[PDB]
Amino acid sequence: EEIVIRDDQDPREMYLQSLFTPGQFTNEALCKALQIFCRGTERNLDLSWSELKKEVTLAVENELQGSVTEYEFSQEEFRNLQQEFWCKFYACCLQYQEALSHPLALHLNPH
Amino acid sequence: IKKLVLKNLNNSNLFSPVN
Amino acid sequence: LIKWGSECLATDVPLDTLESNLQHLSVLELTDSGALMANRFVSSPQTIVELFFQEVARKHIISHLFSQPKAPLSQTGLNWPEMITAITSYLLQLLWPSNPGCLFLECLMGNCQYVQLQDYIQLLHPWCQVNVGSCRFMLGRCYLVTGEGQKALECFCQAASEVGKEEFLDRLIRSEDGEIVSTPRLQYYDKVLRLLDVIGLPELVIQLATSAITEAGDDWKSQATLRTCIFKHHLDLGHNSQAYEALTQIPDSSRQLDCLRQLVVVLCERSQLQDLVEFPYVNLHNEVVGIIESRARAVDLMTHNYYELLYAFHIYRHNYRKAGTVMFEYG
Amino acid sequence: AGALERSFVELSGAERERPRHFREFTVCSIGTANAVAGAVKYSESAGGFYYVESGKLFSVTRNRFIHWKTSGDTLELMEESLDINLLNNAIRLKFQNCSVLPGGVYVSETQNRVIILMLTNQTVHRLLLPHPSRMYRSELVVDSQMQSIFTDIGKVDFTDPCNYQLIPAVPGISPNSTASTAWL
Amino acid sequence: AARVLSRLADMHSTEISLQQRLEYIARAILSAKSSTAISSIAADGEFLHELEEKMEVARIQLQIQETLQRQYSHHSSVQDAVSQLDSELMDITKLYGEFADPFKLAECKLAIIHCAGYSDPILVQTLWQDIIEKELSDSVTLSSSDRMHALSLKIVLLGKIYAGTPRFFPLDFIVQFLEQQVCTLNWDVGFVIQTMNEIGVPLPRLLEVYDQLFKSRDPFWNRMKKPLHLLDCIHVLLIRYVENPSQVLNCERRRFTNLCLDAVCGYLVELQSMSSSVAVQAITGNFKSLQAKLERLH
Amino acid sequence: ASRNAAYTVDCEDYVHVVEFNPFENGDSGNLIAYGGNNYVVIGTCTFQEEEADVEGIQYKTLRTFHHGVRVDGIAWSPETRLDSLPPVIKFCTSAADMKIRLFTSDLQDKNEYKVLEGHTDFINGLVFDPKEGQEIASVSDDHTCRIWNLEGVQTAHFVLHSPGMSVCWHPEETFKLMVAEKNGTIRFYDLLAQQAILSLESEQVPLMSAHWCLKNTFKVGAVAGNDWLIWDITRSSYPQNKRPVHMDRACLFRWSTISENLFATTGYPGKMASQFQIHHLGHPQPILMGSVAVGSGLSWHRTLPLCVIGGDHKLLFWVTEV
Secondary structure: OOOOOOOOOOHHHHHHHHOOOOOOOOHHHHHHHHHHHOOOOOOOOOOOHHHHHHHHHHHHHHHHHOOOOOOOOOHHHHHHHHHHHHHHHHHHHHHHHHHHHOOOOOOOOOO | OOOOOOOOOOOOOOOOOOO | OHHHHHHOEOOOOOOHHHHHHHHHHHHHOOOOHHHHHOOOOOOOOOEHHHHHHHHHHHHHHHHHHOOOOOOOOOOOEOOHHHHHHHHHHHHHHOOOOOOOOOHHHHHHHHOOOOOHHHHHHHHHOOOOOOOHHHHHHHHHHHHHHOOOHHHHHHHHHHHHHHOOOOHHHHHHOOOOOOOOOOOHHHHHHHHHHHHHHHHOOHHHHHHHHHHHHOOOOOOOHHHHHHHHHHHHHHHHHOOHHHHHHHHHOOOOOOHHHHHHHHHHHHHHHOOOOOHHHHOOOOOOHHHHHHHHHHHHOOOOOOOOOHHHHHHHHHHHOOOHHHHHHHHHHHO | OOOOOOOOOOOOOOOOOOOOOOEEEEEOOOOHHHOOOOOOOOOOEEEEEEOOOOOEOOOOOOOEEEEEEEEOOEEEEEEEEOOOEEEOOOEEEEEOOOOEEEEEEEEEEOOOEEEEEEEEOOEEEEEEEEOHHHHOOOOOOOOOEEEOOOHHHHHOOOOOOOOEEEOOOOOOOOOOOOOOOOOO | OHHHHHHHOOOOOOOOOOOOOHHHHHHHHHHHHHHHHHOOOHHHHHHHHHHHHHHHHHHHHHHHHHHHHHHHOOOOHHHHHHHHHHHOOOOHHHHHHHHHOOOOOHHHHHHHHHHOOOOOHHHHHHHHHHHHHHHHHHOOOOOHHHHHHHHHHHHHHHHHHHOOOOOOOOHHHHHHHHHHHHHHHOOOOOHHHHHHHHHOOOHHHHHHHHHHHHHOOOHHHHHOOOOOHHHHHHHHHHHHHHOOHHHOOOOOHHHHHHHHHHHHHHHHHHHOOOOOOHHHHHHHHHHHHHHHHHOOOO | OOOOOOEEEEOOOOOOEEEEOOOOOOOOOOEEEEEOOOEEEEEEEEEOOOOOOOOOEEEEEEEEEEOOOOEEEEEEOOOOEOOOOOOEEEEEEEEOOOEEEEEEEOOOOOOOEEEEOOOOOOOOEEEEOOOOOOEEEEEOOOOEEEEEEOOOOEEEEEEOOOOEEEEEEOOOOOOEEEEEEOOOEEEEEEOOOOEEEEEEEOOOOOEEEEEEOOOOOOEEEEEEOOEEEEEEOOOOOOOOEEEEOOOOOEEEEEEOOOOOOEEEEEEEEEOOEEEEEEEEOOOOOEEEEEEEOOOEEEEEOOOOOEEEEEEOOEEEEEEOOO
16 A cells, blocks of 8 residues: 655655556556546557556656746655655555456356 | 659648648 | 566567577577567567566476376366466476576577576576576677677686586587587587677687687697688788788698688788788798789789889898899899 | 365466457447436446366367456456467447346357357347357467457347347336346 | 640640540650651651650559559549549659658659659669669569569669669669569579679679678678578679670680689688588589689680 | 768777776876777877867877786776876776776886776776765676775675666766666765665666766766667656667767767677767757777767777777867
8 A cells, every 4th residue: 555665765666666567556457547647538548568657657757847836946855746746646556456356256167 | 844843841631622 | 586587577679689689599509499480469568487488488388298198188178276286386497596408598598688687697696506607608698689799708708617517508519410529618619609700799709719729729620610710800800910820820721722812812902012021921932923923924014013022022032043033034 | 186275376367468459339229218317226247158168178169268247338248268369359248228237148158159148127138159169160270369259249230139139018127136047 | 746746745645634645645656756767857756755754754643543543532632633633744743742742652652753863872772772672562463583574674774774874873782782682582693693794784893793792791691591692693693704704805804714713712711611501512512613614714 | 971080099909998088187188098908008199179280180108007807997087187297197997807907107117006806797887086086986787886995995885776887976966976777777876875866767778878968967868779868857757868879789878078969879899890970969860970890989088079989909089060
């Protein structure tokens, strides 16, 4: 539900590892988080992993750029805003991975 | 005329009805 | 390391970058691997362990499991609990850090996974003491395909210590031609010299063939072809005095006729006419004189100073009597 | 071998592919346009089927199966395979002015056709597809990608009275029953 | 008759309405070739080039409009464009800018630039690739022997115009590209040698090209698994010289028999550095058989 | 087409790396350093573009230092000067024996240097303390960046997520270091907190070389796979300008010493020659293209729009428009 990030680490690296690590998430969860975080119209996001990372990071960068309202700021305030705007994406992916992990039946082959 | 002149700038939309 | 290989992504490598790498790997005779072309219509990135399963390990695991079948194959059913457990168990054995077949590293090299192949060899090297020559050779293949080719030569000179020990190195040296007269290291050095000329890094062809001449101290056949190859690469560039010595080491007294016939032409056609004159060479004193005399007796006397060149040559070769006859014919 | 297998582990099939393209087909159930849109939300549900030759080392149905998911007006269907990838396997069937019954999907094999029997709150349906041993003519596949039984479904008439039927209001469905069973 | 055949070949030539007035071009050509054969006046042969130049532009406009019918006949303004590529003589500028780019007829863009004149190295090299790859394209329905013969006829015809002007005939590039096509298509090793021989390219200058193309050690021959190919070309070229020595001038031939022995010694040093496969053994035999004929040509 | 070199100089051995002196400390501004299979050479280059009584070029050797190993990389100290009595030549090199050599010379007949040891495969990149000259940063295939003092002690280090391929020290904020990694990441590190600051991505693997624009410190530039890549740190973690550059892959990058829109890049050694290009952010193309026999290294003259590349027994030089 939350990621530990050290003070020798960039928060964008840690979240872009976890979001794209094999079998944490589905493309079906990530694309739903992306469509709704972008507050979008009906984009059919038929994307690969190496396409999808770019639209995900650029969506977070456009929202983060949308938050810097003054002309002078600290590297501490930047790392805090970076970590908020990534957690705010990650928890959205997790809620769409819940809603796609939910169980509907068993299937068995006796052959 | 044998001479050729490229002019991409203004063309007529081939795929389209005429105004 | 098996967690990391099961999480680490394979690269989106182009077909152009794969068919070129395959035509750089056939240079070693290693591979019936033409089947790699059949399946790359995939809609997803794989991990380096998934890539290894689909294009190598599954082909071996299913050969092994049906090698000695406990009932006729038209009467064996598939039992999922025994099948999946045995397939994953043999994939773990084919990923084990001490496995002497090198097939995982060969899959990464064959599929151009040359960053992940440095990081995997580096996570392995401080504590595993198996496949060490195979790992320095395949790290040398990384350093070639990243352009770090002088590190690659040192990694091949390291891996050369371990030929005659590791099935991948002792596989790399194999042939259908049966003149088993050379050393396993000279077979390995030829396989790497083929690669360095098929890439075209002539420094490393010159340096490695010099390092091969010490482990090739008798054979005469391979000495004559390798020294002809050193002579050629020096002369292709401009190393006319290094070409010279690599050539005077040629034991094949027929090749030392033809190698001069390249050198004298290339020195004339670069106008490097002093290199051509001081020149101790061995053997072909008569043939150079016959080429200059036949050229002098065919050309116009006021267009090319061939008689004064031939005089200067006969004087400097302390043959004043032939210098005199040449100047008298000229007058 | 085996042991006694005292526990199992779940692995996801969390594929890193582009989102599997569910080919959507509108089942325009003739006559349902008189329905009152007080739609009964049931639950969602899923299910599956196995070929009778799927366990055999030399079968064109070896390691193949069929599975489905249901929500609202919609039924989703795929064929899957551990052996060779299945082109055009993904489909979606969408029942106008109806709602699907949870578990109201049944599959029957025959030596010529796969037959799928489907139930909504107002219409029953019979879909028919080729069996793989009528598509393919060989104990040798050479193709590194196969076509699914679902590939050719764009040639089926979903308004044919041999395939679709409006459920008669007498005897009539017991109100809000999901439960059914269908067979050949 | 020419001043009324012009008034059936001005406004009036493919038809540019599309099909009856190509008979008027071909018949005006027949009438002007009949005029000049009965009465060889300047002007009735000057008007003949006007008609045979109009005849290739006419065929390019036919290649355009039928390709709109054959590809795009479900678009509304193809009826407009068909009625336009009907009624008038369109120049190379109209044919490219108004039709072949808006419809994107790559086949017809290649057809237009084959006709659109010639001008110095980079564009000259593109146009020689365009001419080769059009004749490779439009011959796809025929066998390798017939496609060799068609490409030979094209490159021998245009080579007999441009080989007299070495800004417009980039011999060295045409030889490399034709051999890279032969190496791909699996045509004869005698092919590019025959084509350059039948243009009339001086055989010593033809050798200077294959000599430098081999010395390039181009990764193409290696990437096509034929790393020997240009030595087989040099063998066929030098055997063709040896068994017809009239292909070198009776003063130059002695200079050339040196250069051929000097080069054959070079290629035999090269070959005897290679791994001794049956091909390297056979070609070492072929070049020593060639040496053992050149040693009698002097 | 290629441009011929404007100027050429010949050597005792092959050249594998070459770098000009970037510093303005006491008449040292025209010094050049280069490395071969056995040695490092120090000399000077005057050009007709700086001294009006010179036709073309005056090259001059000052000292060869023979140390019996290849030279793989070179970095200058800011302490280097010719105005002093004696002069001070101070620099370091990397070499095939996985070690750093610190040289300090008064231009007497000497062959004296200090060795620093502890990297565990080859060393791709070196940079001094750009201001006081008292430390050296170093990157290697051993997955480390390492800081070292003149006493030869490792003073700090950072672990990387691939081989370290490039390193740059900030000249004013001298507590900030840039590193670039074979995985395609470029990171910034703080030397006083001993922590990471931020990172950038190439989209491309391998990354082969990166450089920091010391005429506009918001600009980063690199090569990876077949492209050159340029970022602006005030905007995005991805390359604001990206272009395919070399067919045979791309190897080195250098920003111009004098212009924050001018830079150069090399390909790999293509069978007989390395290809190179000069690029300008105002242009859709390279402005200069070049080709060199086993062409090696890449550097820029301290004051001229002039670049240098080594190779087969030579240094070769090109002048460009701006």
